[PDB]
């Protein structure tokens, strides 16, 4: 563990500090091509409006399938990609776009059927007016999204950069009711990075003190569900490996991600950030 901390630091010296290797790797990464990588379903005429960003469409081989029988639009399609870590049965996350007005019922169906109870949201809803994600929850009281009643139970504001919202999610078909906890990071702007890595890391720690430990996937979204969402996942997967002890390849770990959803980590600056974040956390642990 501390052992693996020093192993990560060694890696950081060769891949974060050496700017040449950063570039080279990112250049490698940009050209990297997943196989398979078809997204024919996502590119159907019928699913065009269910996609926010034409640049980031879920692969046919790695998409969440809504149960068409319970679907709002009688369709299985949602732009969400399961993301496996250890286990090919149980994906650790579902990365998905910011739900659109057209797809909110769908987003909740995926939350219900995935058994998900922790959501991570890494965008504000608007950026100097530029919409990122539809306001898919009620700011007070109850809203109905198809057969999914969502009630806002409470809302806890930790700091300038993040808050938590607690929901009750009732399936009106089955009369069941679950608590879904939504972690909302507010200072991570489109195609950019947080100013404080310390905030994003504490935010992560809070996400995981609440998740620990559940079968169901964490639902991570932002905008395209690639850039920020992927930097989170990448940062979070690499520290989990430290969490449980040998070898470390962050570039290779990112490939594993891009095998499962295109676009993951949109910028070299974001990649640089994910690295800097892992390093800083590992500097803190080892300091103690
Ligand atoms: Cl089909």
Author numbering: 724 to 968, 970 to 1012
Give passages from the manuscript.
In the second category are PTPs in which both the gateway and the second-site loop are open and accessible as found in the R8 pseudophosphatase group (IA2, IA2β) but a cysteine residue occupies the position of Arg24. Surprisingly, sedimentation velocity measurements showed that all single-domain RPTPs studied (IA2, IA2β, GLEPP1, DEP1, and STEP) were entirely monomeric in solution, as were tandem-domain receptor PTPs (RPTPα, CD45, RPTPɛ, and RPTPμ).
Protein tyrosine phosphatases (PTPs) play a critical role in regulating cellular functions by selectively dephosphorylating their substrates. The ∼280 residue PTP catalytic domain consists of an α/β structure, and biochemical and structural studies have led to a detailed understanding of the catalytic mechanism (Barford et al., 1994; Zhang, 2002). Key features of the domain include the PTP signature motif, the mobile Trp-Pro-Asp “WPD” loop that in the closed conformation positions the conserved and catalytically important aspartate residue, and the phosphotyrosine recognition loop. Here we report the crystal structures of 22 PTP domains, including two tandem-domain RPTP structures and a detailed structural comparison of this protein family.
